Amino acid sequence: MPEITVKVRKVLNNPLLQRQQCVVDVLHPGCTYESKEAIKAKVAQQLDQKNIVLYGFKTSFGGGHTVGFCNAYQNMDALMKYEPGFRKIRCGLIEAPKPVSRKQLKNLKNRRLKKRGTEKAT
């Protein structure tokens, strides 16, 4: 097992969003890592294991070097407000309701606009 050693680059404090900016690079010459999950512990050590987000992970030619981003929040509430939804859905933070086709929504909107007075029927 080739030990994987990860760093922290470009540390910036963001009290406005209550988070820390972060560029994280991981060296795994030989084998690979485990779905970005083993990395959370190392990042937490270097800078709660459930208050970080990783999203921009790219593997270079040959697989020797992988570079990405991280976002560490001070509270779960802050992560709940300042955060796009799809990130929460990708993470195990919330559940995703079954999306509906926007075509049906447009059709319903046009149909309703067609009616007059009380059109809540359609």
């Binding site: 910036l12 009290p15 406005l16 969003l17 900016q21 300042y82």
Partner: protein, 258 residues
């Protein structure tokens, strides 16, 4: 011919000194009317997102501004497209960062950090004196501000110091030979020098000849000559003192930094 005013702005049609990537998108922010014009300003979002990097998107900047986290000349502004101009005060109390917006030698906007003692005022250029309603004397400036009942000793093209808290004039610097100035338009934006000559042509422009500290001499029209004190600057200026290096020295500096 468009039937009304313009609300959009193509990215390729934006000012060069904003430094916007060609592939960022089709569109660029359109600044709203305010203290400064389109070509002598820079939107707030560009400073807050593409420079300081405290935000990564339009939405984050919108939240930050509508939560009241930036003060411009002592007044909170919630508009992401609010225009920021020359000799403006940029303070962020949440991180105790205070900046004054000035020009670099290359001809772009820069943030010079300042102190508490000098952040209670700003410098303004007076370019118009007129009589208003009831014959009351008035006076306007480069940041779209008007002051009633100015001192008769104040003339056009002068420079005025006003307290941020109260728009009251303290002292004024006259436009005269031997006064340090700063160029704010054209090929020589960001250069600092002292006035050596003044030549006027009836019915046309007035040309000002300035000499830099090192002996270099340059010319520009009076419409973009800003007085910044009496032989010594009144405010803190960038680390460099308005010296534009030649391409050779800039290349040497680049290689050294490489």
């Amino acid at each position: 011919m468009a039937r009304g005013v313009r609300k959009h702005l193509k990215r390729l049609n934006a000012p060069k000194h904003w430094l916007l990537d060609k592939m960022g998108g089709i569109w660029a922010p359109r600044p709203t009317n305010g203290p400064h014009g389109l070509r002598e300003c820079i939107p707030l979002i560009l400073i807050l997102r593409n420079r300081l990097h405290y935000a990564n998107t339009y939405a984050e900047t919108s939240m930050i501004l509508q939560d009241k986290n930036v003060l411009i000349d002592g007044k909170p502004r919630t508009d992401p497209t609010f225009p920021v101009g020359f000799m403006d005060v940029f303070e962020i109390p949440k991180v105790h960062k205070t900046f004054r917006v000035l020009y670099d030698v290359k001809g772009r906007f820069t943030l010079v950090p300042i102190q508490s003692n000098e952040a209670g005022f700003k410098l303004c250029r007076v370019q118009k004196i007129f009589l208003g309603d009831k014959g009351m004397p008035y006076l306007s400036t480069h940041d779209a501000r008007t002051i009633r009942f100015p001192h008769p000793d104040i003339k056009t093209n002068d420079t005025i110091k006003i307290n941020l808290k109260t728009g009251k004039i303290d002292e004024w610097y006259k436009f005269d030979i031997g006064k340090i100035v700063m160029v704010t338009g054209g090929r020589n934006c960001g250069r600092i020098g002292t006035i050596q000559a003044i030549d006027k042509h009836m019915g046309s422009y007035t040309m000002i000849r300035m000499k830099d500290t090192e002996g270099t001499e340059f010319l520009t029209r009076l419409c973009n000559v800003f007085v910044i004190g009496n032989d010594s600057p009144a405010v803190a200026i960038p680390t460099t003192k308005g010296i534009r290096p030649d391409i050779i020295k800039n290349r040497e500096l680049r290689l050294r930094s490489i």
